[PDB]
Design a protein around this ligand. Structure first.
Ligand SMILES: CC(C)(COP(=O)(O)OP(=O)(O)OC[C@H]1O[C@@H](n2cnc3c(N)ncnc32)[C@H](O)[C@@H]1OP(=O)(O)O)[C@@H](O)C(=O)NCCC(=O)NCCS
Length: 131
């Protein structure tokens, strides 16, 4: 399980990962964007195949997705920890995420990592002040 920073040359690999995900997975991966309508990306690789992708934006917001067959192995948690580390190195004041209330796995990660949660019927908001 290797976690590395993504480069422009990884676009094709990420594209293939996305093509294998469900519409539900993609909806959750870009939840906030769907709701309201530079960045650093990390990938989780098994062999030479990207099985997980996580991105951090300049405003502290992050998101990620792990292929269904590679879930519950701790990858999502490791990717979020990687993003938090990146956020601290880049001097961000806060990191945050948005998802659906039914997304138990993500909320579990958020809570165990220290994120303060705000719940609503249409969405949930997690946030952690770093500075
Ligand atoms: C949310 C997501 C990244 C989690 O990734 P993952 O690799 O499975 O994460 P982890 O293995 O670190 O597990 C996270 C926790 O959720 C739990 N979990 C997994 N499946 C579960 C299920 N069906 N019910 C309950 N809990 C579940 C894990 O057991 C673990 O428990 P813990 O936090 O006490 O250790 C993954 O499910 C995913 O890609 N989902 C679709 C995209 C998405 O929702 N992205 C979120 C963006 S903010």
């Amino acid at each position: 399980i290797k976690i590395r920073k993504a480069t422009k040359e990884d676009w094709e690999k990420i594209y293939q990962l996305y093509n294998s995900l469900s519409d539900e997975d993609l909806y959750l991966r870009f939840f906030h964007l769907y709701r309201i309508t530079d960045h650093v990306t990390f990938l989780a690789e098994v062999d030479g195949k990207v099985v997980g992708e996580a991105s951090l934006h300049k405003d502290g917001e992050f998101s990620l997705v792990v292929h269904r067959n590679y879930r519950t192995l701790g990858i999502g948690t490791l990717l979020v920890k990687t993003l938090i580390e990146e956020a601290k190195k880049s001097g961000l004041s806060t990191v945050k995420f948005y998802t659906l209330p039914e997304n138990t796995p993500m909320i579990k990660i958020g809570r165990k990592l220290g994120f303060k949660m705000r719940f609503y019927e249409d969405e949930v908001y997690g946030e952690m002040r770093l500075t």
